[PDB]
Amino acid sequence: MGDSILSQAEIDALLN
């Protein structure tokens, strides 16, 4: 199974 990697944009949604 592959990892769940988030893009900078998806990351921005909850952290930036």
Place this chain on the structure above:
Amino acid sequence: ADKELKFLVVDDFSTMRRIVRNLLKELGFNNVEEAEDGVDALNKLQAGGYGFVISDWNMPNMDGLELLKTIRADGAMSALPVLMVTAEAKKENIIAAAQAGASGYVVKPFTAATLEEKLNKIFEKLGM
């Protein structure tokens, strides 16, 4: 923010520290110190005077998440801005950093624009 604002850049490798220190300089912030891991970082923060923390995740002795958590639980540093700059990008970790109170999160490799952008949004809050 005030150009004398004191920063602490934490990473176990100088590359990230140099990049960040130079971008900070480009924005006008020269009062910047460095640390090599969470413990090393806590020793400097305890000395006082810091106003902003930017740090890596994967570091020996005490990683970035643990550093963030101790800072957030410390009565003398609980509101210290902590911006994560790290290669770590797995979802469970992003969510963990967010739940622990990270002020922001930038994924390595990052452009000058991304860092200035993230930094500026945190700065705006510091003013209200």
